[model samples]
Target chain A: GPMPGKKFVARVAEARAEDVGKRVVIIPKAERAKVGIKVGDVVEVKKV
Target chain B: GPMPGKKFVARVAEARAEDVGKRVVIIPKAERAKVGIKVGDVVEVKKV
Candidate 1:
């Protein structure tokens, strides 16, 4: 089988409360390198 | 003040499920371009 991926459960800590449209969250390079995640995609998180 | 905003909630489906390490989610270029997200960022999702 292929290698499994890591899993993380995070919350929407903060969001831009001033935009006029749908806003997607994004992480910077260091975090992305650690998690292997990219931009513009929808991630699954457990909300509080 | 700025304008209103749009919100989205989705689920985690078909995760790597095999690796022994943590896996971060990512979206491709097109999607990122649309959502204005960058790589290596944590996003909030409302899990099912």
Candidate 2:
């Protein structure tokens, strides 16, 4: 099993600054899986 | 070969936002080669 609160590698989504209400990111199907994510099960967004 | 002034796929560099002086980007080695870009030859940054 992976550690809790582990980090993953990803990049910013190709989108407008305002598209996601100012700085949103999208994950690809593969990348989502790469980060131990499942489709339709998105991790929530919060300020760092 | 590719088109001139063409846009290649890229994503934000995995860096500390404060360290990059705002929205910095990095192209993967394989991807740079894919877009006809050589190492140490960085494309200019411009806004849309």
Candidate 3:
């Protein structure tokens, strides 16, 4: 299998650090365009 | 901001198709060394 084309360690913060859900993760807005994904898409966040 | 150096789309399957969890994901073993991470390390999977 090919390796991941792009990856990184990012600080996964809560949305406003006020409210969120069990499987809710927020990433940089611009990243949406970089990866060509939209909201509600599935993204895996492996815990380091 | 630096884009993820590596990323890709893969079939997210259940381990053995008999068991899994809400937050469990399995990746290629070689990738652990490629990204310089270990078991329990965090890796982001952005959908396409």
Over A1-48, each residue of candidate 1 has an lDDT whose tens digit, in order, gives 212222333332222333213323333345444443433333443221
Candidate 2 residue spans exceeding 4 A from truth: A1-48, B1-22
Per-residue lDDT tens digits for candidate 1, residues B21-40, read 33333343454444434433
* Model 1, global lDDT: 0.34
For lDDT, candidate 1 versus 2, the one ahead is 1
Candidates in order, TM-scores: namely 0.26, 0.25, 0.30
Error of 2 at B46 (Å): 2.6
Residue-wise lDDT of candidate 2 within A1-48, one digit each (tens)?
222222222243333333322222334444433444432332322111
Ranking by lDDT: 3, 1, 2
Pick by DockQ: which candidate is best? 3
What overall lDDT goes with each candidate model?
0.34, 0.31, 0.38
lDDT winner between candidates 2 and 3:
3
Q: Kindly list the per-residue Cα lDDT of model 3 for residues B1-48, writing each as its tens digit.
A: 234433433332323322222222334445444554443333455452
**Clash tally, candidates in order:** 9, 0, 14
